[PDB]
């Protein structure tokens, strides 16, 4: 989505400033974790896929 992550809050708006930080740090943790594991899981599957192709070529000859 089209989003502007940046927000501005004065000296008497620290609670909603920290709520905004919690939203940003929340998305950060969710995305870093999911993106990292996705890479780990897909790389395993890709190297397993190559193993299958080499094996299914030997087991055709």
């Amino acid at each position: 989505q089209f989003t502007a992550v940046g927000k501005e809050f004065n000296h008497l708006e620290k609670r909603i400033e920290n709520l905004n930080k919690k939203v940003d740090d929340g998305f950060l943790d969710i995305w870093t974790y999911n993106a990292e594991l996705l890479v780990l899981l897909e790389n395993e599957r890709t190297l397993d896929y190559h193993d299958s192709n080499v094996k299914n070529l030997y087991e055709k000859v």
Partner: protein, 108 residues
């Protein structure tokens, strides 16, 4: 008075001046107990000047409060004052759609 004859919202900004002493109030507006009134179809607020010596910021013991409101297309804005009103000279006709960036990065 002003009527929004434009086809969009008009940003109107004004100020309420608060002098340091009663002598400073009289040498600027001649009236002791003054009032400012600003009103639209939605907006309505009276302003009473709070006369007191504040700590010096840029050689000033007085303060000036800056107020704004959006005038709807076809709506009317009214100013009534007996003193202390920093009146609008320039307003802004606009169509709103984002964020603000604090940076020293060059524009290209």
């Amino acid at each position: 008075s002003y009527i929004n004859d434009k086809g969009k919202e008009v940003l109107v900004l004004w100020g309420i001046h608060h002098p340091s002493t009663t002598a400073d109030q009289q040498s600027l507006y001649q009236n002791a107990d003054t009032y400012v009134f600003v009103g639209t179809s939605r907006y309505s607020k009276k302003f009473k000047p709070e006369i007191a010596i504040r700590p010096k910021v840029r050689d000033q013991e007085g303060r000036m409060n800056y107020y704004w409101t959006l005038v709807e297309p076809g709506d009317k804005i009214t100013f009534e004052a007996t003193g202390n009103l920093v009146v609008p000279r320039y307003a802004f006709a606009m169509e709103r759609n984002s964020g603000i960036i604090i940076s020293d990065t060059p524009v290209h």
